[PDB]
Amino acid sequence: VSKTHSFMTVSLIELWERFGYYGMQALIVYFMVQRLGFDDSRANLVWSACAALIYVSPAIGGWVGDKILGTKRTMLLGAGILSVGYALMTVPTENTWFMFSALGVIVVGNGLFKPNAGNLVRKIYESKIDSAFTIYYMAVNVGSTFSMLLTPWIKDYVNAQYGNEFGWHAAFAVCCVGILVGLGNYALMHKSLANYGSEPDTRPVNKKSLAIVLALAALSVVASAIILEYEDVARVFVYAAGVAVLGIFFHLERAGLIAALILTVQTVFFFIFYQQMSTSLALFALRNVDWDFQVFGTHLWTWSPAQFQALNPIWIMVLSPVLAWIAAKFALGFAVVAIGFFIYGFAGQFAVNGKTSSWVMIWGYASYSLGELLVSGLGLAMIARMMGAYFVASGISQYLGGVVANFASVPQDLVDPLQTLPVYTNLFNKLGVAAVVCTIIALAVLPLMRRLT
Amino acid sequence: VSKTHSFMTVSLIELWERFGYYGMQALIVYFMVQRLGFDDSRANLVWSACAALIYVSPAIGGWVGDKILGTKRTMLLGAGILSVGYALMTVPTENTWFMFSALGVIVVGNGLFKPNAGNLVRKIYESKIDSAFTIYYMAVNVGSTFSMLLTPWIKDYVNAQYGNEFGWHAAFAVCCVGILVGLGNYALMHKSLANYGSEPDTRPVNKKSLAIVLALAALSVVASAIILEYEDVARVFVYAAGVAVLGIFFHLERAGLIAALILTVQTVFFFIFYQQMSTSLALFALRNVDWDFQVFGTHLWTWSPAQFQALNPIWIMVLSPVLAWIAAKFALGFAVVAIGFFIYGFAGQFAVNGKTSSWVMIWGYASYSLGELLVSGLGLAMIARMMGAYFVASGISQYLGGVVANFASVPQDLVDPLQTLPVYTNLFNKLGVAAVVCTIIALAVLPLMRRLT
Ligand SMILES: CCCCCCCCCCCCO[C@@H]1O[C@H](CO)[C@@H](O[C@H]2O[C@H](CO)[C@@H](O)[C@H](O)[C@H]2O)[C@H](O)[C@H]1O
Ligand SMILES: CCCCCCCCCCCCO[C@@H]1O[C@H](CO)[C@@H](O[C@H]2O[C@H](CO)[C@@H](O)[C@H](O)[C@H]2O)[C@H](O)[C@H]1O
Ligand SMILES: CCCCCCCCCCCCO[C@@H]1O[C@H](CO)[C@@H](O[C@H]2O[C@H](CO)[C@@H](O)[C@H](O)[C@H]2O)[C@H](O)[C@H]1O
Ligand SMILES: [Zn+2]
């Protein structure tokens, strides 16, 4: 029919999918701590392990979509599988193996969904795909803004009208019906727009490969769940992945991909900072920020700590037209990040009563997410001048980011915000210095970049 | 004889002039504070006012040499005049007006000396005026290394075998015989190499203009001494020079020199940091650094605080071959300066007994002088794509650097190093952050400099 309409339909189902995902993510760490009983260094570790799993998932899921089931049918199967993930997260049980399974299913289902939705935009436009992708990208941010703005307060609201359960589970149900929404959306527009796109979708579904792909999926859910439950297992598996990427690198001309080596170590650093906002900045928000947001000197409104993360896509959309108006922008990325961290770093020496900051979150997220904005060029074709080595590197860096968040973990018997503030600002300051170390590294590695050219 | 020997003589007489000068500088703030009774916020202001004067002096002096007296005879005359400056500084009196005159004389005499020695370096080579000038720069650094290592130690030694005066005046006498040394050098070589160079030096010396410039020079010493002694005077004329450069800029195609504007405001900041090392870091060294230097883990040796500043040219020599082996190099400069300030910033939370660091000076100074090195592109030809506006902004920034240095001034009645440590590391840490803002400014202003091209 057109390329814009199927770019539309794929961007819509994308949008609702991410709605579900990020709504879920903000609440997931606060859940592991506040409703489940987890201390915060387990909370970080489990979340980061599940994060790395999630980030490194679309490798296999993509290969399954491209060459085994259809790209569309795989994308759909992902959609169903995560409708079921959130569905699980919705049953009111305080048993971790249940939640851990639910997270396992989201890992599997996500690996099946997103490389294939992205792949379909990519097939819809043959070039203009980058514009397409940026448009695509913005769909993401909008969905996730609303999701994150929404889900915590559903939990808040419900935890207020009823006792502790659901509340959280209500929110996870919101996620679920977000996925479901995106699915009805997809059907109608299924044939409406999607029509031509995929490769092994041109022939009828090989039910043995469907079977075996399902079986292996459930297995992956169990494997995931045993990675999440047992910290030491996950840590070993991450470490193995580490010695693996070091293998691939140390046996893989020298100037261009010692430049590539440097590039992905700098990728890893960047992701550690990025991981900081699910985890350490989240707990600092929960523990040390006046949730009363005043526009000096009005009142409204009053944050729910989780909602702070919505400032991320918000600022992205906000700064997206401004930037509309050369690996030196890594340097800039890192520098601006450094300054975000220093903003939280001096969340202490100004506007403090123990629990006080508020605007520290806003400007922090501006600086940080701006940094993210100036590095949307970390595709691997950009260390070309291999999906595996870098994707695993990057997953490994999600987990690592969780352990750094653990460099600022607070005891559960320590509830005096007056004493927890220092711990968080100490982390944040040494990250800000780290981000400047990293800016130095970037700018210093730019001579190798025009010795290759 | 050859152009290499006349580059040789001008570099030799240069080296010794700079010898006298920097021996004097290190010792000058410690003098105003320890032997004179000045508190450090006066010591900072007075030394910084003298600094700005010194830096903008070579304007008049360069033109006097080019267009009124000879370039050779003006350089020489500058030399005599600073023989007399340091000579003055050596007479043992605690008289403020006395010293201030001595400094006035150093200003006059410098303005006559350095622009002309440098000018004739530039006539000796007719593109390897660049090779010549970097060699020249190295001659400078080595000389100032000798003096900075020597004179403080003289001051200590003589202050030990005799009572309070000389010690210091002894050190300044050392400077004076440094100038005198360089002068004998020049005599011999007077005719030997220097021979041809200058414009109004080809005809016999016009004694009306000799008499009138000497007279105006005496005046320059009185105007100087009164700008230094009375702090408020200096601050008024500094302010005046301020409204002047702000004028000239904002009534003085727009994109390239709004970029030039940005470039010189970052030069201005840069000079503030660099001034931090005569001042706040010097006092910090004198007050909160274990002067016993240990190379893990024997004893040798034991510093004199002033001698710490010798680390500046030392590292320059040490790292200048390293760099032997793109105004983003301004960005990098700022970033590296930044971690220098963070090294001193966490000179406390590391290695502390009250008065403790030692290596902090070394690594900090390593970092600073690396930054200085990587920004040798602050020629005014680098904001072409104006001697005055840039020079005056730059002097004004010497003084400003003095007032920031003052953001860490300590009461004279406060001698508990345990309390003086925080004041200094707080200055230093937030300078480091400011320096990351400047890294961000520079990288951010690089699109303007590729729109000029
Ligand atoms: C339909 C298109 C999407 C439009 C953009 C997205 C809309 C956002 C939906 C959710 C936003 C609401 O989520 C936010 O949560 C906090 C606290 O939990 C609420 O805070 C509220 O509860 C507390 C507790 O009684 C009150 O004292 C407070 O005055 C009140 O503001 C806010 O009312 C709300 O701003
Ligand atoms: C492709 C689609 C995939 C969809 C898969 C969805 C299925 C998910 C199943 C969720 C059920 C989890 O089931 C869970 O099993 C574990 C065993 O490890 C039990 O484990 C339990 O017993 C042991 C006894 O020693 C306790 O110490 C432990 O703390 C406790 O959690 C849980 O009580 C049970 O609730
Ligand atoms: C041409 C290149 C020039 C670069 C090198 C120039 C050489 C240096 C010139 C003079 C060096 C003196 O600089 C240094 O100062 C300190 C402190 O006063 C001295 O310290 C000395 O006196 C003190 C006090 O009794 C002792 O504790 C110490 O053990 C002893 O070494 C050292 O003797 C010296 O190492
Ligand atoms: Zn800091």
mmCIF file with all atom_site columns, N, CA and C in Angstrom, chain A residues 156-163:
data_model
loop_
_atom_site.group_PDB
_atom_site.id
_atom_site.type_symbol
_atom_site.label_atom_id
_atom_site.label_alt_id
_atom_site.label_comp_id
_atom_site.label_asym_id
_atom_site.label_entity_id
_atom_site.label_seq_id
_atom_site.pdbx_PDB_ins_code
_atom_site.Cartn_x
_atom_site.Cartn_y
_atom_site.Cartn_z
_atom_site.occupancy
_atom_site.B_iso_or_equiv
_atom_site.pdbx_formal_charge
_atom_site.auth_seq_id
_atom_site.auth_comp_id
_atom_site.auth_asym_id
_atom_site.auth_atom_id
_atom_site.pdbx_PDB_model_num
ATOM 1  N N  . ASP A 1 156 ? 1.145  3.282  42.920 1.00 0.00 ? 156 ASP A N  1
ATOM 2  C CA . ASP A 1 156 ? 0.950  4.134  44.074 1.00 0.00 ? 156 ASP A CA 1
ATOM 3  C C  . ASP A 1 156 ? -0.538 4.167  44.332 1.00 0.00 ? 156 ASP A C  1
ATOM 4  N N  . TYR A 1 157 ? -1.299 4.478  43.284 1.00 0.00 ? 157 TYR A N  1
ATOM 5  C CA . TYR A 1 157 ? -2.719 4.701  43.471 1.00 0.00 ? 157 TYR A CA 1
ATOM 6  C C  . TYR A 1 157 ? -3.344 3.431  44.022 1.00 0.00 ? 157 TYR A C  1
ATOM 7  N N  . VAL A 1 158 ? -2.990 2.290  43.431 1.00 0.00 ? 158 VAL A N  1
ATOM 8  C CA . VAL A 1 158 ? -3.624 1.052  43.856 1.00 0.00 ? 158 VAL A CA 1
ATOM 9  C C  . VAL A 1 158 ? -3.122 0.645  45.230 1.00 0.00 ? 158 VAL A C  1
ATOM 10 N N  . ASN A 1 159 ? -1.835 0.869  45.505 1.00 0.00 ? 159 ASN A N  1
ATOM 11 C CA . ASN A 1 159 ? -1.318 0.514  46.828 1.00 0.00 ? 159 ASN A CA 1
ATOM 12 C C  . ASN A 1 159 ? -1.952 1.397  47.877 1.00 0.00 ? 159 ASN A C  1
ATOM 13 N N  . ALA A 1 160 ? -2.637 2.434  47.415 1.00 0.00 ? 160 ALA A N  1
ATOM 14 C CA . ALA A 1 160 ? -3.305 3.339  48.316 1.00 0.00 ? 160 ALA A CA 1
ATOM 15 C C  . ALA A 1 160 ? -4.747 2.881  48.528 1.00 0.00 ? 160 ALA A C  1
ATOM 16 N N  . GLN A 1 161 ? -5.399 2.409  47.467 1.00 0.00 ? 161 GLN A N  1
ATOM 17 C CA . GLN A 1 161 ? -6.800 2.023  47.601 1.00 0.00 ? 161 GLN A CA 1
ATOM 18 C C  . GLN A 1 161 ? -6.939 0.570  48.092 1.00 0.00 ? 161 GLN A C  1
ATOM 19 N N  . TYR A 1 162 ? -5.866 -0.206 47.968 1.00 0.00 ? 162 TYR A N  1
ATOM 20 C CA . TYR A 1 162 ? -5.829 -1.594 48.447 1.00 0.00 ? 162 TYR A CA 1
ATOM 21 C C  . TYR A 1 162 ? -4.456 -1.880 49.062 1.00 0.00 ? 162 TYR A C  1
ATOM 22 N N  . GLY A 1 163 ? -4.335 -2.988 49.784 1.00 0.00 ? 163 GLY A N  1
ATOM 23 C CA . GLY A 1 163 ? -3.158 -3.213 50.606 1.00 0.00 ? 163 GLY A CA 1
ATOM 24 C C  . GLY A 1 163 ? -2.016 -4.012 50.002 1.00 0.00 ? 163 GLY A C  1
#
